[PDB]
Each structure stands twice: as C-alpha cells, then as structure tokens.
C-alpha cells in the first residue's frame, strides 16, 4: 500500500522527514520536557484530519496519554487558528489515559477494535499517538537486572504498534523523555531540542537513508509552524 504522509505544520520539519510523518511506521520523537514533542503530537492530531492537499489523510486520531499531557483546549486553539471547527476536530480524536504499562498494552488492543471499525469509512483512524511510550515501563521495571525484562516488554509493545501501523496503514507517533546505549525499535527517531529562545530544532538519529540536516520550527497559536 502507498505510504501516506501527515504534515507537521512546519515546511522545515516536513523536509527533514521526507514529506511528513509516515503511515506504516512508528516515528519516535524524543527530548526534554517542552522540547516540542507534545506540541507536535497535538498538532498532528489536528493535521491528520485535513484532506491531503492540506497535508492530512482525511482521518481521525487516537491518543494514549501516560503523563496527563493531553490538553483539549490546545487542540481547540490549533483547530480554530487553522480555519477548522474545534468541536468537530475534538470529535475526531479518541482519547485514553493509560494508568500503568499493562493498561497501556490493553489500550493498544482496544485501539485495534476502533481502527477495524472505521477502516473502510470516509474517515478511518490514520494516527495513533502514545505520549509517552516509556514512562510507565521505566517506573515499573526498575532496579537490579530490570533492564532485560523492561526491554522485552517494550519490544513486545512496539511490535504490536508496528503491526497496527502496517496492517491498517496508520501512522504511529510516540514520544519519549530521552540511556544512550539502550536499543530502540522505532522506524524513525527524531531528537528535539529548545532553540535560540524561541525556536525548536529537530535532528534525525541513526538514519543514513534520510537527508543530513536539522530542521527549525516554532511553537505557535497554530501548533507547529516554521
Ligand atoms: C472538554 O474536555 C474534553 C476532554 C477530552 C476530549 C477528548 C478528545 N474526547 C474524549 O475524551 C471522548 C469523549 C468522552 C469519551 N471520549 C473518548 O475518546 C473515549 N475513548 C475511548 O473510549 C478509547 C478507547 C480505546 C482507546 C485506545 C487508544 C487510544 C484512545 C482510546 N480511546 C474532549 C473534550
Ligand atoms: Ca512539547
């Protein structure tokens, strides 16, 4: 199936990604709090809803929140500033708070039911966000020799998400707090950092196949833009 791409709202970041966030892939965005990873998740939850000439996939979004990061008023602001109806935009986002890592796994199985339901409609699910993927796994699988079991549980969770992305042609977008020696299984990893007082900077990590460079974007009333 053709890969679909969702615009991030920034021409700079879209160029770095090769057009935007891809379906049939897991894109992992990592950085410090406020680096723009949650702002990007919120922007994408709106952008995916737009028609393709506007950078979307005429789709709906599903958002798994592990750290109480979801702000429905922020989605409303992005939608209104982009010429969209905020209530209709919120109606196209399914939201769930994951209480722990095991509940986070169950939520992914429930996501598949909604995805299957809407697959052949005029507005299928096209984006699944997990913000953040690792927080519960890092707090639960902790201490002496916990690395092996945590990485096995994370590897399994990521395999389930890769399956939803590939089987249903959806973009899976996950965020992560930031160690350097651990393995990662995302299709694409993006490092975000706070820039020159106002900007945010993005770099691709371990992607020889994709272009060398860094993107610069801003957090605005429209979510993410140049
Ligand atoms: C004014 O404050 C607001 C606060 C939040 C919202 C959000 C956008 N909308 C909702 O909360 C809506 C309205 C009430 C129920 N509801 C759900 O989305 C219920 N969700 C689910 O049943 C569900 C199930 C499995 C899932 C697996 C993965 C990800 C998400 C999943 N969501 C809107 C306004
Ligand atoms: Ca952020």
Residue numbers in the entry: 108 to 285, 302 to 349
Q: What text comes from the article?
A:
Compound 5 was too insoluble in aqueous media to profile in cell-based assays. Accordingly, we made modifications designed to increase polarity, while avoiding the introduction of further hydrogen-bond donors likely to reduce permeability. We replaced the naphthyl ring with a quinoline, converted the Ala residue into a Gly, and introduced a 4-methoxy substituent on the right-hand phenyl ring, leading to 6. Compound 6 has a clogP of 2.76 and an improved FP Kd of 8.0 μM (n = 22) against ChimRAD51. Two independent X-ray structures of 6 demonstrated that this compound was still bound to the FxxA site with the quinoline accessing the Phe pocket in a similar orientation to the naphthyl in compound 4 albeit with a shifted binding mode discussed in more detail below. We attribute this to the truncation of the His residue back to a Gly, a change that can be tracked in the X-ray structures of intermediates from the optimization bound to HumRadA22F (data not shown).
BRCA2 acts during HDR to control the recombination enzyme, RAD51, a eukaryal protein evolutionarily conserved as RecA in eubacteria, and RADA in archaea. RAD51 executes the DNA strand exchange reactions that lead to HDR by assembling, in a sequential and highly regulated manner, as helical nucleoprotein filaments on single-stranded (ss) or double-stranded (ds) DNA substrates. Structure-based approaches to identify modulators of the BRCA2–RAD51 interaction have been impeded by the lack of a monomeric unliganded form of HsRAD51. We have previously described the development of molecular surrogate systems for RAD51 based on an archaeal ortholog, RadA from Pyrococcus furiosus (Moschetti et al., 2016). In brief, we were able to produce the C-terminal ATPase domain of RadA as a stable monomeric protein, and by careful mutagenesis, to convert the surface of the protein to resemble human RAD51, with the ability to bind the BRCA2 BRC4 repeat with high affinity.
